[model samples]
Target: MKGQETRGFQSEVKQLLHLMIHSLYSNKEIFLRELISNASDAADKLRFRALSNPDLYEGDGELRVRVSFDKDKRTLTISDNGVGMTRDEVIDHLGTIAKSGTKSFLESLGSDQAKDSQLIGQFGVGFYSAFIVADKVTVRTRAAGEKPENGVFWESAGEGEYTVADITKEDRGTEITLHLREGEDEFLDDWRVRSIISKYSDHIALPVEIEKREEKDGETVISWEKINKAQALWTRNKSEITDEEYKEFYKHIAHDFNDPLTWSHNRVEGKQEYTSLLYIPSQAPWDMWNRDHKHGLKLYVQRVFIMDDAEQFMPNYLRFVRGLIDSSDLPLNVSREILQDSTVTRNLRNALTKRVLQMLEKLAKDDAEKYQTFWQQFGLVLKEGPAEDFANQEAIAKLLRFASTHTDSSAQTVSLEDYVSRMKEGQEKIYYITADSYAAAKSSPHLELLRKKGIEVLLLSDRIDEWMMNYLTEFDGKPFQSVSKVDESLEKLSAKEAEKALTPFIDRVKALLGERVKDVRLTHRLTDTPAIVSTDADEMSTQMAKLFAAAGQKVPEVKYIFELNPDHVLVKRAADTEDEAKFSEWVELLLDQALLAERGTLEDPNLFIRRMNQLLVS
Candidate 1:
């Protein structure tokens, strides 16, 4: 082994070092794609060089790109069994910019399918793209036909200097690993690489494999699944693909320019001969869409695209689905008219919908871990389920996630299944409270008794949750309990007994707030707040009313029930009061402040400002 030498990059690469790391960067993920492109180029160089001598194949020519990561060390490696580099080759190549094998390779390509369409291998600062997500990068490589002991190790921190040494390696080819920077941990997720691979390198003809972990009998078993497993795309059999290919398919057909969370590609054979490729795009597209405008399946028969917007293949609420269907059984004379009534279309729709449901079920079962990976973007469309499809209602409901008291995090990481499993003992119903904004819901005075019981309540902040819950009844056979209505039947939560803490000031407030009030009552959910407002369990809440009108439908008026926190010192001071206008001011101040706290906004700021200022003098 030779001593490691430190050398500054060529003047030009040094100039663009910042460009590699920051300002010039747009897509950080493309770094992985670009590195793999280098590996692909390396393989082609080896393959072509070996044409002079078959022995260079070393009988190990089955090229593979292995992507693996270590979260502990915060590193990701893109490895290839392709050709590597000699020590001088390493220094000569990596020591500078534009001096990569790109020019010689492009002086490249052949007529054979294997050697044809050889990669563009353009390493123009693409190698530096890793610096977008990584602070340091290391390459260990042995060019083919070299003795095992004659390999090289080179490293750079995307700074002025890099180090290189001649190192012994029993293997041939290259393995590049990144020492990722902080906040770049997003690259650590397997599915994210799946997505990037789906987006960037899905066209890579050679196998690019990403693995997954499952425990069997207390031991971790790692299994490699090619994310880009479908290739030559759908025309060929289900033999080759990388995840990025699926993402391109999403971009191509959905005509959206982002990646999907996951997708399903299945070839159904035997009696029901059809293949379905469905994608759950990561974002909800323009919600103003009506199913009346069909963005349906790109229907293909026997690999021939028959028509687009074959709406008969999709259900209405699944409007969010960017799916494709291939059928061998359907007649080629397909029109929307024939598509609407055909038996083959019916069977395929049933299976595709089943598969779509299976995809939803998989996101819950296989993908998420109380993290933003699954629930953040597309959950609103999922909320459209129980209100729309009764047959698929229960299946879709299990996929629903809500912001709950367990995390108190605005992120809706807990699904009903997660909430139900953690339900406190003697808790008969699933407790929930819906509000206009996240902070308002969390700070609601109504949460006090539920918080005291240490019970988990689903904090519903989405506009549709109010309307959706009203359409539903129960989950896991447990009834729904709204936190606002303050039920007495929760005698078992000991809530009824514990919450009997109303105060004398409730009467004085009721006197001044006559027609505006609906049975002013004391709160069980508040210990800090003076007083607030609520709705009878049957009456529509304020936010839900706005949701209806915002959705372009009209909503009627409401009379909210006023509530007081008995333990508050403000309530005690107001309770002791015996005056006319000043008492009126006291009651009005508590009412307006609590009203703003409940609604999260005030429609009448002037009167509340006057009350606040008047109370300062009084």
Candidate 2:
């Protein structure tokens, strides 16, 4: 208090602290991760700056992060001999949320505590997570190459305000001390601190050392022990890294409990230079659908980490991939914005994307069961590749999978290659239909014709299927054709003689349902069902329309054509009935039921039920 001056936290910081402690109670251990990550980042900054001005590093060039806890004092400190902040930097960075999205992040955290915690994790302001465990935090820092008298001390109880002052420090780095609250004594143990560091920060490129106490020669000896192996696994020779060691590093970087399904470690040299270590996760994260939250490969320059979740290095479709990329061609001081325009960065991204695709290709070819498992976890995300990357569309298409008529099961074991190999004798396009579920896709009347002809129809039920189909127009030489779409190609299978005989009947139903349908026609696509709905080849499918509507978007209005199976018994009865009212009811029921089967819902389901009851009584 003697040398410190008191100041209130920025309004956003106050709100963030309150949200973190209450919302993220389930993940309190992440506090250590944030502090260590910040320490590692500080070391990286020092390394980057030292590249231009070596004098900034002073005499001590080796950068590292240290974790130590004192049981007697109830304190834990994470120190780094990296780029230390000056007095103003300490005030500006610590006293406020220095990032741009602070207001939006706070606004987004309404009352949903569960989702708010995930949002907090995505925001990456790991510094303030300290409040989850510590009642008070103090910081002592000196800027690199600065005089000892220029050092600063910052302290806060995480209430609403903090204090800052000048102090004399002998180090060219920062030390953060967390005063543990009551009931947090578990963190004051050497083993506990070491475990947390190993669990969360082991993948950090910098050495993370912890102070430990041991008995030696009848005396208590204190020494610093390296808790993490600290070397970047990607930089090492592939043969030297055992699978167990590679998995251990993955656990640290991913914070994932399960082992990765597969990983690719490669060193690329030729046109552009980089080392990429990529992994296909065994499972998707809970927030994988939250696209606003960025996730990607950790980016490093010359083994110095530049950023985490560097989205530029990989396409959004491959966001599930977790690993690091160290580039030798890019500038050491490169920023995310600069990376976008840098040709070297682009080449590196292209190479990494190619490597990931190649690894997946190998996995799919060499091991069918493991590849199926990988597809089960990340297939939907990979479906995003065709639209995102045009150059690799064919490669990604080869890796795609779907359920098919070849098997009764809903598991996506059928590959594009599998589908293309078994195409019907005259078929020019691969047929598929999207629905809300496997049951819906499998049971749809659209598949009846294909099933009867011994032709396989790819059953697609994922939410992304409709969106992906727009870009994945063709694979190899054959185009993708939706069976539920009315097309001239489908007319090739139409029984023209029977369709002509039912024209009068089709015209009668057309009159009964004037505007509800774009047109009424006889169908070869329906075998058992009396009537079925088909969207025009160019129009959005009912499934895609429903998806857009659910997302609160305004899709253009498009009506489906109702096609009547002229061979069915119900069609003859509707055509020959004398009671006009009864005929209309039967026609409406047929149309409504077909719509229900196609989209799994109807706007007027109660009316459909009442009509069916009345028709049954008559």
Candidate 3:
């Protein structure tokens, strides 16, 4: 008990510990993976330090991770002959959460265990995962270069605080013991432990061993037997590995249940030395829309696991990708802050982005069905690409898919190249419309004339479509024009003779609606629908307003322009009505109908219903 100290966990670390125990019950098996990963990382650090000082190995140079359990005591310990922690290192690394954005990480985890588990993954706080299966955890470690007697012992039940004391140890590394909680006896079996190691940590290059005991000649003998393959999957020759091995490795690293759709394995040298194994998941995560969702390639420095979900190296748009990037050129002790601005990191990032984009382009060109599957799962996230990376805008555009008049079905299979190839003789711009749904965009009055003329118009229904449109102004020399805008579409469909004849009625309707509409006029753009709501030529579209409002943000106010079909029954009845009161009601009904069609909602639904009932009775 001499030279012992007791201290409480930092406020953030306490919160994280509670969340880990309460929220991550479903994936409790990952606790073994995290401890084994940390063990592997410690071994890597020791190996890196030994490069400069060979004495750090302390004559026990063969580093390995060992897993052993005691059913009698109901305990399991993960031991490693790797870089262990000194007294200060134990308090700094295990006692505190060391990151600038701890507040944001805590705030993002809002009571959903599956979702919060991913955030913990992003922070690389794998150590706390131990609490998921164990009520108490004790860590005994001696720094690789320290004397055996100087080893440190730390124990905690993960309640609010932990205790640390100096202890005499013969080993030169760390050994983490988990006092298994009730109903956690599965972890104490040798068969179960071996299976978990094979499934989650088999790709680790260092030997993962299990202690074997036997009685020979009336005496007990103990030996450590390696259970894992101890080969880094990414470091092997690509042709030598089978598809099954690659998929199993992906499952191990990603903790994902489904197999990957496709993957790319490359070993690059020269300017930047690195090995990359990237995968396109068959499906996106449930919280993928939470753009802040933690997703990226696992990062390793010189074969050392440096971080998980390293987003700086992979752009946000490609966040669905899961894999690892091992850099041979970067320093082993490089910090996350350094990765933020390091030139070597920058070069690796750009190269990685380009590699992913190239793989997507190939998928689209060679495999249409598979590419569509990819788009269906990841297209919305990928839509953020054009605006985020200008250098690859054209390439990203080529991979985009949309539902258009060319396809009667609502599926988004029409590509930009397909639309351009089918452009009409005089069509100068690529036409598209955004609405709440495919049916809304298809039934839109603004597209009626285009449909009649056999001119194709793209239908964009995804919430992100509005935001993506601002960046995709043009494609292959043709500007993208929204059907909600009143410039080009009106000019092309203008019938001056009809406009002159409908002037009197337009004025009456404009006066009746007052400030509700910017203006009222005849539009040949609609052949069957009575009227349509259009935005000002340069103002925000209705879809944009809806998107901003959903996020609880205030956008500049926008007004609509009323474009009526002069020949439709509703407009003709308004023109011929002699009763002023009846005519006013008809005009108001027309405005409400257009508002509902274009905006998908109304300010007052009951009033419109009462008026419609009155008109029907009359």
Candidate 4:
């Protein structure tokens, strides 16, 4: 009697409650989920925030939500050990309409009930959603860290006014009781309540146990049984989740401290109805590069956790994503082996891959800066896209990033679209060169002509770059040509006259080099170098072969094309040499050094060192 207050809604709770009941009554069972979801989240808040002070848990450590009904009174109740409300707080929230970001909720309300259902739990208006099926709603709760004596009682009859008063609550959480309207006795059945909860709240992170009562012989058995499958956080509709919760859940799955860059949560209704929540971590996992490491979404079917890292859900190129998929079409007993060839799984995987690309495509444009972080962390892995995923070849290629001479920096911020946008008017092809490092690729003497023309060349430095370039043809209708290997087009150089002039010298040097040279070529591909080791267009690149050697794989020796710059100072030294002994040294010096290496490659660097040391001593 000492503490009581009653007031009408601050902003016409009449129109608002009328709107809530009439609009949301189209799906009356929705009220159960909205209430329980709020209760579940309240418990989570209490438990999570109580880490520094465990006393917030009070006398009971274990927390669970309870749903029960009183058939005699036609009343339904949901209770929880969650963050609750105080007297003043109850008055503030319960007596107010259009409060806490509901202006848009009210503004967006339309005849579309489907749209309204999604927005119900998103805005704070969900608390009043209880009025959808309840003639009167009562909330009893105490603030988490406060004394039990300060507990609050708030009640509304879906009418003009709500009352708030002081009460005693032994627990820190909220308990909501609904007095169902006229003939809404369906919820008075325990089994009915369980069905409603299981339908909407199956995958909630918290437990929702129902009160069970049984009478056998002359004995009455009463027990509380968990009704929810508790499939987990992904089960909740996306709008019901917060950014921080999404970020936290991502950390739980990915085992990382950094938040996710972005995520996609989709419920596909067509083909196969399934829920997929996918996240891209802000940082790369240490095991990301390991091919043998398990990768994929946690897969659940029909609210049963089938398996973790069900790799069949995603292609290997997108293995870094951390999340789950729950498919309604798959059987509960579906095994990992079965997922490999199931038509349902094929459609799921294909759609999921498309989903990821669509998210990335949006990210690459909308939050371009954030997508750059994604590209840096996972760019190389995505480079594996074209060769492995042939269906999305050009689509995946559009997402590729490279360090082009346009920026002249090691940062791979340039996309294939950017390259194509700035491709030269007369340039017939997209030019690129692969080295072990960006520095080496940028400085390669082979880029002299393209550099002089101010046409850009992609500086591909990663180990996967060479292998990727092999199958990554027709990227944007432009063919990829490597600068170092394209010693074919010398552009208007009189190679006929020059080769005739040097036929004797070239033939002599070819003999000296013997089995190593396919044939010594007269050329001007190099601007300042004496010689460069080139390979046939059809042959494997030296860089790719070098990677093979590094990995302990053996490849046949490359009978490379050794080219002399023909117009340089060092070449003149070799051409003008007078003695047979000195001329032999010149061929050995330049040819041997050309053999000394390529961009991050070496067939016989050790042997080339042997001859060089002997010559130095002589």
Candidate 5:
């Protein structure tokens, strides 16, 4: 009897409920969709479960969800004709944060808003999203099992706790009515609630009907009709749809708070007649690179739902495109094998991919600011696309943004064209260095010689930059040369220049540094810094080193060649040092400093710190 009074929320539920009301969701309009979706899910599950046991249906096969707004009463009622809960089931399910583990489901949802099309009713948290709008919500339900089953009433203001008690009911389904707060009556309007539903839940696979009234003969005639389109709009002709419709489609398919960066609405009317309305969101979902992440823009044949998580609709490079594909050309029993390799499917895929790329290119040229925002979100994903889809590599690379040494970081990024435009005579390759972040790339001592020579180098950042760029060997016939690597051809100066460059000193320093370096050479590249270290022109890019690390493989030891400014005062001293031991310490210090400059952290951080402090103290 004492324990029966312990009927409140679980501790986690209490804390999470408070946060949901105060912090989690930013918009209150989300609550309407949450409640509506929960009702739909409840109805769907009831129908699904009724299949195994016909007795569970209780002869009420018709299942639907309805919401009515009462402005005067300040109440919004959500009614569902589906399996309702019993009194005991109410306490167990509602009293705990145990509604089929929706929190974990949300946590796994990650940053990819583009994939929002693939997810629905996967979490119980959507039900609580109602609290974001309602000050209080009341539930009334009767178990669908038998005549002995009585309805239960559950009421919660969501302040600290909720109350549940046995109640008499005539219905076999569930209904939750929310008492709106001061400004929450806006949802009570027919237009407002309709707009929210169409925006969020329009594509839900079930019929979401609403009761509406029309004035006939100066009298209001009430009728129940489906408020949502409830059909795949992507299958419609692009010319028929309006811009507003596109926005709604984007919100539903992308679940994005903002509009898409770009979208393509087209219909293919050849052998494989089909329609597709796809979108590229302005912002990538938080997890764009998740290998296992399943996204939408699914493929369907006719009106029947074929499959939802088919990843072949777009390449991994174009993973951000979200919408649906409806093919009228495929056979009724066509297996996925035929779908993927079929000439019809292949043609559609090629056309669609080309259109997506062209549309993005147009968007970039038409609106640079908006396109830049897209690049900020998804630029890294595109880098790898060139490697996978080599035919499109050059075109995609043109759309990328990068930091340049020739220009201030704050200025507009220079394209390969712009960089090539300003290239000095005899400059044979595009120079760049990839690092974990921009700050690291900018601070690299490896860039000192290039910067001194007034050569601009591209600063590539983000973890994927190297992985994506590795396959890109050259641009416009000019090879991509990593500034972090050294080259022997760089040592091949003109005879007149070599004579003036102190070859003897370079050779002595080379012998002194010994196996610590692959080689040391006098430089024609240096304009200011004392020394620089770079990978050989033929060696793997720095990105390969990181890619190996990420894949749990050991990167082979690759020796970097040192290129020094012969005229620099520090280089002059090292060349003339009478004490070999002192000169060797200077060589180690120079190489280590170059390593640090390249944003390559030393394996022994303690030594780096000690050396840094010693330099500071001296």
Candidate 6:
């Protein structure tokens, strides 16, 4: 095909090529992702080059990537309107794996598995992967500068020898054409190529267009229209798009199913001219809180994509938001480091944070039932954000929901704000009980007194509640108090009667509990349960305990207080019974039951059960 005939193999090269053909043939489809990724990298490199010399863009600097198929020619082509390679570049990049001129560019960054993927396209041999399902592959390319008089063509059978010489190119980009392997003809279908493009390359930063034939006015028309609206959707006006369109776009960009729980679309017209579309999904991704998971947020400048999943624009707490910000004020070619600290971007970030909180607030207020449904799906993430996000604490406070004594145990949960609004005149503290499960926390004995007094006490059952509540000590001027931590000292109108009722029992319970308890005391807090248990305010919250369990660690030592119900029948019987052994066992079992309800199964569930059975048989 060139000036002279060349050898079919170069000893070791021949052997390795054979191995690649047979060994990797079973995983042939990987060639598609590898080739598409290569195309993306080519486009990225062109953008980087344009930074130093903007003229490299020629005329169409938009950097669109495209894939085309020819059933008649038995060929498939993937092209990128980026900086195309020269004849030598095509040979160097496509001839060998991990052997390319871009090695230095790839090695400059520290090794992260994700970062490694960015260099996959830089590797030239990725184009050779087409050989996995192709009989022949041809590379048509044109250099960025006018230094080359004409475009060049590089053709190879992938056996050993290949031809690199001059060819005519109508475009200033690169296009790869593959002669399909026998049974791989399905890839030649228009629908099949479109499906593959949608699956792997639709989310790519550039537009992926496919040439199509359609009948219009009884005449067949053949033209190219971008199959992907890779154009900046965030920069567009909100009124022009419907909710379903936004949701579908979210699915396309997010690469996820299930609709978003909340999203914000705002265009700032002040010192910063920017538009942001951010969403909070109804459910966490596979590993939402993994430190290593890739953060999601796209950053655009003048409607041109700058970076994807950019973390510097938004803090790690709001990483769940999968959306983009298009800033007209930002220069199209500004460096990433500058975007991180720009006052314009900072204003954009502040606006986005406020809009998200407002959207969530509306979701909660618009319909109580739907809000509950959302809370069931993603409430824990709000607890995570509310505890750490200081700027919007008041708004976050209103968006929160948890089971509490204020709402009927049979119907709807309530927020701390709702609880405080209905509080008695002297109720200074807002109380909540955090536990492993909603049912357990709802029935906790710590609520006995509050429920009887008609005071609303919040029940936080979400897994993150305890650790989150640690930093949130107060809400709306009132302290966020935990009932399982300590009993509020209450004043009674009949002190003498209460004292007589507690005297004989308090001493006996303190002696029975011994060292396991801080002290045993008769309290006015209890109504139905015989006893309740508590520790110091600084003790581990129930959620913290659950987290510790997840991390495989033993809980630390904790001192607890047991508050007994003098009015309950069980406590009165313990006071009346002459036999101290049965009553002492019952007292111990009651304390363990209370602890179990608050934080789930006690240190020894069997022991607590045995104690109950022992007293019942006697």
lDDT of 3 by residue, 1-618 (tens): 448988884776576667645555666787777788887778877765654454665665456789888888889989998888998989887776335335545666655742643444443335767877888899988997787888998888886798999997887889899999999898888878888788765456456888788898799987888775325889778879999999998888887878877788898755555789999888787777775556658888656787777778888888888898887535456667867755556667889888888888888878888889999899988999988999889888998889998788978899899999989787888889888888988878788888887889999888788889999889999998887787854465544553447566777777777887888877767587887878866677787888888797995577888888767887787788878888887887887888888777666887778788787888
Better of 4 and 5 by lDDT: 4
Task: Report, for every candidate in turn, its global Cα lDDT versus the true structure.
Answer: 0.72, 0.78, 0.79, 0.75, 0.68, 0.69
lDDT of 4 by residue, 507-599 (tens): 888777788777778666647668777886688777777777768888647668878877788787777777887788777878777655473
The positional error of residue 581 in candidate 4, measured at the CA in angstroms, is 0.4
lDDT (10s digit) by residue, model 5, range 471-493: 87788889887766655544453
Better of 5 and 6 by lDDT: 6
Residue-wise lDDT of candidate 6 within 1-618, one digit each (tens)? 233223244776666665445444555666777777776666766655544454565655455667777778788888887678876676676645444323543454455631544333332334567887887888878878755445767778887777676776667778888899889987877776677667776445455677787899899998776765546566567778778878888888888988876678888664445678888776667777666655678877646777776765665555677877776435556665765645545655677777767777887777677668766666666777766778877777677777776665743467766778788898788888777776776777777666776777887766677777777778878987777766444435133353544576678777766898877776766467777766765665555666888678986556677777777888777677767787777777788777776557566888888888888887
* Candidate 3 lDDT: 0.79
Provide the TM-score for each candidate, comma-separated.
Answer: 0.56, 0.61, 0.61, 0.61, 0.56, 0.57
lDDT for model 4, please. Answer: 0.75
Which pairs, if any, clash in model 2? none
Clash number for each model? 13, 0, 0, 0, 17, 1
Residue 159 shift from truth in candidate 1, angstroms? 93
Q: Per-residue lDDT for 189-241 in model 1, tens only?
A: 99988877876654553457886888998999999776654433665554677
How do the residues 14-84 of candidate 2 rate in per-residue lDDT, one tens digit apiece?
Answer: 76567655454667787888778887778777765544554665666456688887778889998998788
- Please give the lDDT score at residue 112 for candidate 4: 70
Lowest lDDT sum, 10 consecutive residues, model 2, at 116-125
